[PDB]
Amino acid sequence: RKEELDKKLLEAARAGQDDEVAALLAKGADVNAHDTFGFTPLHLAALYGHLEIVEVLLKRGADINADDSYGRTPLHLAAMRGHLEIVELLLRWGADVNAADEEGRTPLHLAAKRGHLEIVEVLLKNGADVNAQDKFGKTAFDISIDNGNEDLAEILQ
Amino acid sequence: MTEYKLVVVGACGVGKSALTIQLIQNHFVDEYDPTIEDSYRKQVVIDGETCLLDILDTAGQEEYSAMRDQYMRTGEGFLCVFAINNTKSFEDIHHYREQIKRVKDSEDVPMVLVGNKCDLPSRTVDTKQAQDLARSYGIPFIETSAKTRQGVDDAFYTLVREIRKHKE
Ligand SMILES: *CCC(=O)N1CCN(c2nc(=O)n(-c3c(C)ccnc3C(C)C)c3nc(-c4c(O)cccc4F)c(F)cc23)[C@@H](C)C1
Ligand SMILES: Nc1nc2c(ncn2[C@@H]2O[C@H](COP(=O)(O)OP(=O)(O)O)[C@@H](O)[C@H]2O)c(=O)[nH]1
Ligand SMILES: [Mg+2]
Numbered sequence: 001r002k003e004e005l006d007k008k009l010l011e012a013a014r015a016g017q018d019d020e021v022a023a024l025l026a027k028g029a030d031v032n033a034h035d036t037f038g039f040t041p042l043h044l045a046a047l048y049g050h051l052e053i054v055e056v057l058l059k060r061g062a063d064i065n066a067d068d069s070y071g072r073t074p075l076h077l078a079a080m081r082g083h084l085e086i087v088e089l090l091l092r093w094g095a096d097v098n099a100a101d102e103e104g105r106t107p108l109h110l111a112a113k114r115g116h117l118e119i120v121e122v123l124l125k126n127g128a129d130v131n132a133q134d135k136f137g138k139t140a141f142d143i144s145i146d147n148g149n150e151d152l153a154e155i156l157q
Numbered sequence: 158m159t160e161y162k163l164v165v166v167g168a169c170g171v172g173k174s175a176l177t178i179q180l181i182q183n184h185f186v187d188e189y190d191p192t193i194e195d196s197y198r199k200q201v202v203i204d205g206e207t208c209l210l211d212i213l214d215t216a217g218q219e220e221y222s223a224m225r226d227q228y229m230r231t232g233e234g235f236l237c238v239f240a241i242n243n244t245k246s247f248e249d250i251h252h253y254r255e256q257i258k259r260v261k262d263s264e265d266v267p268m269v270l271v272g273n274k275c276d277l278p279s280r281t282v283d284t285k286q287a288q289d290l291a292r293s294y295g296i297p298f299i300e301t302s303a304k305t306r307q308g309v310d311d312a313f314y315t316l317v318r319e320i321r322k323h324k325e
Pocket of ligand 2: 173
């Protein structure tokens with residue numbers, strides 16, 4: 001029952017059915033439920049670009065700082081997917097800007113590696129450590145140099 | 158340390174994410190997000206030497222992705238993973254191989270054929286056909302099973318050794 005309801009909530013968040021998400025939340029589902037890897041409904045809602053589902057989960061009490069088995073918070077997924085509205089909403093709710101995953105990758109590092117300039121500048125505006133170092137000794141500037149993107153290097157400087 | 162820029166390519170549901178997670182965290186994920194594409198860094202010991210593996214789990218169906226194509230061009234080895242219980246994936250392995258050949262624009266590209274889901278007893282792709290395809294392509298074939306974590310390390314080490322042989 002509880003597991004099935006949580007799985008239905010996760011599937012509704014992944015698919016992008018706001019009505020189904022609202023109905024499942026009204027039916028007793030858990031906003032902090034995690035799947036096998038650890039993706040909470042907020043993780044999937046941020047990953048798949050459903051701003052309304054993200055807002056509903058945040059209002060209902062979703063753990064915004066929760067992380068999956070690899071330490072990736074929903075901010076990490078929203079940054080790696082290049083969702084400007086989602087990252088702005090997550091930062092507006094006090095998400096851990098300098099959060100670290102199992103490799104110690106700041107969401108700034110993920111946004112730089114993917115190639116999302118707007119996400120990078122938005123994260124920097126809200127206090128993102130440019131000098132942040134992962135577990136392998138690579139910063140955002142190093143990632144920009146490796147990618148060779150001149151615009152990313154200009155923004156990071 | 159040597160940073161090997163590995164890539165893992167294949168069809169949907171073949172187990173690329175499962176293999177990568179088994180290598181990185183040594184635990185199998187029964188269900189994983191179909192469209193998660195991220196790079197995992199691992200410190201391994203091969204032939205007594207410490208090496209760094211930077212493995213990309215290509216799982217995005219988008220036609221254009223600057224990070225993905227840059228990683229593919231800069232990649233040094235490719236794991237072509239297919240499910241033995243899925244003939245369609247085995248057929249699409251050739252399409253992935255020719256796509257990688259066109260992108261890299263190189264005749265000799267380090268590739269390793271991987272047959273995932275070896276634990277399942279309803280095998281659909283015969284081992285003989287896969288071995289014949291591998292020997293025709295001149296690349297090793299390794300059978301892996303992410304659920305039991307058998308052959309994953311062997312497949313990754315074979316890819317690394319093939320990369321080293323191509324470099325030398
Ligand atoms: C179920 C989700 C999943 O596992 N996926 C794996 C990645 N993927 C995928 N899809 C896809 O259509 N192509 C592709 C491209 C980008 C261009 C032309 N043809 C194809 C298909 C018909 C093979 C993917 N291409 C690559 C890839 C290309 O194309 C060239 C060089 C190196 C490559 F890796 C790829 F890695 C994944 C592709 C879908 C099925 C989602
Ligand atoms: N029994 C078994 N199942 C597997 C194995 N590898 C992957 N799977 C299953 O394949 C399903 C989809 O794999 P997925 O993680 O999506 O691979 P991907 O599509 O390449 O990212 C998962 O639910 C796994 O249970 C394996 O080695 N053995
Ligand atoms: Mg995947």
